[PDB]
Amino acid sequence: SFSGYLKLTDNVYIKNADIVEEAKKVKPTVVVNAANVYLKHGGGVAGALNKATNNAMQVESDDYIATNGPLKVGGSCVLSGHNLAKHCLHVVGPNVNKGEDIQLLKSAYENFNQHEVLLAPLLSAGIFGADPIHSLRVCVDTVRTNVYLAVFDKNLYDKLVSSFL
Numbered sequence: 001s002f003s004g005y006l007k008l009t010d011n012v013y014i015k016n017a018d019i020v021e022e023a024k025k026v027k028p029t030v031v032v033n034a035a036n037v038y039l040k041h042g043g044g045v046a047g048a049l050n051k052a053t054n055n056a057m058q059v060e061s062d063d064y065i066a067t068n069g070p071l072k073v074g075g076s077c078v079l080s081g082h083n084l085a086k087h088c089l090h091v092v093g094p095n096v097n098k099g100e101d102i103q104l105l106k107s108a109y110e111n112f113n114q115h116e117v118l119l120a121p122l123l124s125a126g127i128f129g130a131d132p133i134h135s136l137r138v139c140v141d142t143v144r145t146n147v148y149l150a151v152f153d154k155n156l157y158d159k160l161v162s163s164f165l
């Protein structure tokens with residue numbers, strides 16, 4: 001199970017870790033993917049999770065999109081976790097680099113409330129363009145279930161912990 005996490009609140013924990021390495025180690029029930037509406041797992045967390053599954057996550061995602069169409073920004077879908085987790089909760093946070101409404105980040109985090117425990121990245125942070133300090137604040141103010149946040153960047157992890165209020 002989860003180890004070496006810093007407790008931020010009653011239900012939010014954080015660690016400086018590669019979410020792929022963390023998923024392979026723990027084999028959580030749910031690993032969250034930082035997805036886009038098309039489930040095109042090209043870069044960031046999505047590209048790294050997909051590569052770890054030997055592209056099985058992308059093949060499965062393309063079948064999902066062919067059947068259901070794209071997700072909504074702020075929405076999610078539950079797919080297989082392949083070799084990384086029981087399930088992968090693909091959550092679409094707003095991409096501010098594409099002019100998506102940052103207010104949709106709270107709706108994106110609300111998807112975590114349907115799962116008792118999750119391994120997750122900070123939504124809309126990194127290549128999605130939003131402020132990670134703001135993403136952590138929305139996470140702790142929205143998620144009520146047990147969330148274990150994996151922050152890849154050490155300098156960001158330190159800044160998130162030192163500025164947490």
Ligand SMILES: C[C@@H](Oc1ccccc1F)C(=O)O
Pocket residue numbers: 121122125126132150151152153154156157
């Ligand atoms: C949210 C994401 O942020 C970064 C990733 C890579 C470089 C810089 C970052 F600020 C993370 O560390 O998990």
